[PDB]
Structure 1
Amino acid sequence: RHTFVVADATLPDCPLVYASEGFYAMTGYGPDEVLGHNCRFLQGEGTDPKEVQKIRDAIKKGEACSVRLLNYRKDGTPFWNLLTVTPIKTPDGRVSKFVGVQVDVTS
């Protein structure tokens, strides 16, 4: 199982512009509270700041990244998210969108 989202790299904070049907179902949020916002709303006090830093750098460098984060649902309950980010580039070498595949690997 996996979910899928899209971020807009032309905007400075990479706001999500499209989320799959499982993303809203897995996390507990709805489009009205997801679109236009950075994905970071899923994090909490248990999220490893070293792992978050890896995604922050790969987004600035415009390269791919894969991390294991402790994300939280809308009801505060935790789940473990195997996140993979991939830069989508235009022909001129510039990054237009970031794409994310989230897998709930809490087992």
Structure 2
Amino acid sequence: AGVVITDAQLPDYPIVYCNPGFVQLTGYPSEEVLGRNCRFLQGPATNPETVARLRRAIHEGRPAHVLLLNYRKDGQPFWNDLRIAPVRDVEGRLTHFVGIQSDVS
């Protein structure tokens, strides 16, 4: 599965890490992912109601679990079984979010 960790302090929530699984899934190299928001995987047939629900959860700092349509680098679509979860530190401060993508096409 793809595993990404976005910095939840800077605005826009950039990716600061992606495993090899996420590079095989989407087809993007680690150098074209780091620093960008994971919304680049969306496209013309991505359901906006699923995305809106996902952006509310991220903005409220709560976990999420959705099924939205994404698009590899080659432009081929795939069902993405995304699962978001908020990470906090020792003194109770949101620092990161962990995402877990799984292809269920």
1:51-102 per-residue CA deviation (whole Å, 9 max, x = no partner) reads 0011101111000000001000001000000000000012443311000000
Measure the CA separation in 2 of the matches of 1:85 and 1:36. 18
Give TM-score, length-normalised by structure 1: 0.94
- Which ranges in structure 1 are unaligned for 5 or more consecutive residues? none
> How many residues end up aligned between the 2 structures?
105
Query: How do 1:27-106 and structure 2 match up within 5 A?
Result: 27-106=26-105
- Which ranges in structure 2 are unaligned for 5 or more consecutive residues? none
Q: Which amino acid aligns with 2:26?
A: T
Measure the CA separation in 1 of the matches of 2:71 and 2:2. 15
Matched residue, 1:6: 5
Measure the CA separation in 2 of the matches of 1:59 and 1:90. 17
What SS class does the counterpart of residue 56 from structure 2 fall into? helix
What SS class does the counterpart of residue 35 from structure 2 fall into? coil
Structure 1 stretches of at least 4 aligned residues deviating more than 6 Å after TM superposition: none
Measure the CA separation in 1 of the matches of 2:14 and 2:86. 14
Give TM-score, length-normalised by structure 2: 0.96
Q: Which amino acid aligns with 1:50?
A: E
